[PDB]
């Protein structure tokens, strides 16, 4: 048995790993490269799509499913297994990617082909392919997210997919993995733990109370698949102590994802499921408003507070959020709250450095609004959580993280007596 990394090697996007065992070839994830690596989506996979026997998707994020249409475009016509939640979320994710994408590397017929081959596989259900047995484990990273357990030829491999941050409340705690001969694992935050969730939420509420009370606007850059909804969950469960104010989910996609949530109740934490059992949707705080078009979105730029505004892009690469910032950062009564990681060198990092001004949409904008970075809202396991999840596993191969961060985690693993390496693109690892 062997596993070949075809993405996320010393980087966080492009996840796709080819499992070769028992005359079978199983692709684990098929994600697109994003940001600076975007162009790579137009390059070859590095393997023959037509020779793949099956595909398993750990979750619906674009960096895990974004190249699937390309796989079918290149001839693949086999099944694609994923939890029902992932299957449903995927359709929204792929259709959106198809419409907003700059230089397309796949067309509508490819998306249609990909969606038509999806087959539901839930946690603990075993897939039998040749002499290979595969099953999903609870990853607690997104509704329907999982890690993969593959057993065959007397060997056991575990692919972590992305692991969640157990301190949070919306998703179930990730399950521990079985003892394995090899574990292919993400190390996104291999260098450090996150700030505790509880205190992060208290701080979040204090920022909203002060800002809304003084008539200002709380601006929140956010991604649309689960982070935006988690903030809505916090607002629903704790809004009672906040001043009355409209909450604008200024993201059609986040709106579409939210409408799907009631159908995905069984995929959330027990706490969330208990709320739904009481009859009310915990993801819809009072005053919620989903903003569908540009006209109303722009209007928010000049409308006075108090108001809470959630918008993408989550890492400020573009989107409605940029217009909100352009018009909101110069007012000291406003507050900018980051609830998701901002990579070095991006606009977010630039703002976090707190310079006197920042250039947005071709204009120098004075930075007067307060700025807060709440890393405790991270949806990835922190270094401490990563170490706990990997405890007792003899061999680990790291992927999905910046080299320096994987190295930091790897150092600790080796010191703990666990064999560890940083996966190299296209280089097979024996299990
Ligand atoms: Zn990922
Ligand atoms: Zn993810």
Swiss-Prot record:
Free-text activity regulation comment from the record: Inhibited by cadmium, cobalt, manganese, magnesium, calcium and nickel ions.
Phylogenetic placement of the source organism: Bacteria, Thermotogati, Deinococcota, Deinococci, Thermales
Residues the record lists as binding Zn(2+) 1: 59, 61, 141, 162
Cofactor note: Binds 2 Zn(2+) ions.
Subcellular location: Cytoplasm
Gene3D superfamilies tied to this protein: 3.40.50.10890, Ribonuclease Z/Hydroxyacylglutathione hydrolase-like
An individual GO BP term: rRNA processing
Cofactor(s) required, per the database record: Zn(2+)
Major place of residence: cytoplasm
Assembly notes: Monomer.
Keywords, sorted A to Z: Cytoplasm, Endonuclease, Hydrolase, Metal-binding, Nuclease, RNA-binding, rRNA processing, Zinc
GO CC aspect terms: cytoplasm
Residues annotated for Zn(2+) 2 binding in this entry: 63-64, 162, 400
CDD domains: TTHA0252-CPSF-like_MBL-fold
EC nos: 3.1.-.-
Family: Belongs to the metallo-beta-lactamase superfamily. RNA-metabolizing metallo-beta-lactamase-like family.
Pfam families xrefs: Beta-Casp (PF10996), Lactamase_B (PF00753), RMMBL (PF07521)
Classification via InterPro entries: Beta_Casp, MBL, Metallo-B-lactamas, RibonucZ/Hydroxyglut_hydro, RMMBL
Function: Has endoribonuclease activity towards 23S and 16S rRNA (in vitro).
Protein name: Ribonuclease TTHA0252
């Amino acid at each position: 048995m062997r596993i070949v990394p075809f993405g996320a090697a010393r980087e966080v996007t492009g996840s796709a790993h080819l499992l070769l065992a028992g005359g079978r070839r199983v692709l684990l994830d098929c994600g697109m490269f994003q940001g600076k690596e975007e162009a790579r989506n137009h390059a070859p996979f590095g393997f023959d799509p037509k020779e793949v026997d099956a595909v398993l998707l750990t979750h619906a994020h674009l960096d895990h499913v974004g190249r699937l249409p390309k796989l079918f475009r290149e001839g693949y016509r086999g099944p694609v297994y994923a939890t029902r939640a992932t299957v449903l979320l995927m359709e929204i994710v792929l259709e959106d990617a198809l419409k907003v994408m700059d230089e397309p590397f796949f067309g509508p017929e490819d998306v249609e082909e990909a969606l038509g081959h999806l087959r539901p596989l839930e946690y603990g259900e075993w897939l039998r392919l040749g002499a290979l047995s595969l099953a999903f484990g609870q990853a607690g990273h997104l509704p329907g997210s999982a890690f993969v357990v593959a057993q065959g030829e007397g060997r056991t491999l575990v692919y972590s997919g992305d692991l969640g941050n157990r301190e949070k409340d919306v998703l179930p705690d990730p399950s521990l993995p079985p003892l394995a001969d090899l574990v292919l694992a993400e190390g996104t935050y291999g260098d450090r733990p996150h700030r505790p969730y509880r205190e992060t939420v208290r701080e979040f509420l204090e920022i909203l109370e002060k800002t809304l009370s003084q008539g200002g606007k709380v601006l929140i850059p956010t991604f649309a698949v689960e982070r935006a909804q988690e903030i809505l969950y916090v607002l629903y469960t704790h809004g009672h102590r906040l001043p009355r104010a409209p909450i604008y989910l200024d993201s059609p996609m986040a709106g579409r994802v939210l409408s799907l949530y009631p159908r995905l109740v069984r995929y959330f934490s027990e706490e969330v499921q208990a709320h739904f059992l009481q009859g009310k949707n915990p993801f819809r705080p009072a005053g919620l408003e989903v903003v569908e078009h540009t006209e109303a979105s722009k209007a928010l730029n000049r409308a006075p507070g108090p108001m809470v505004v959630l918008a993408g892009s989550g890492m400020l690469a573009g989107g409605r959020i940029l217009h909100h910032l352009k018009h909101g950062l110069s007012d000291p009564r406003n507050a900018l709250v980051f609830v998701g990681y901002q990579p070095q060198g991006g606009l977010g990092a630039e703002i976090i450095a707190r310079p006197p001004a920042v250039r947005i949409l071709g204009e120098e904008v004075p930075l007067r609004a307060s700025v807060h970075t709440l890393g405790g809202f991270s949806g990835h396991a922190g270094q401490d959580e990563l170490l706990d999840w990997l405890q007792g596993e003899p061999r680990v191969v790291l992927v999905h993280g910046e080299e320096e961060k994987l190295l930091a985690l790897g150092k600790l693993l080796a010191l703990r007596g666990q064999e560890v390496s940083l996966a190299r693109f296209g280089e097979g690892v024996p299990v």
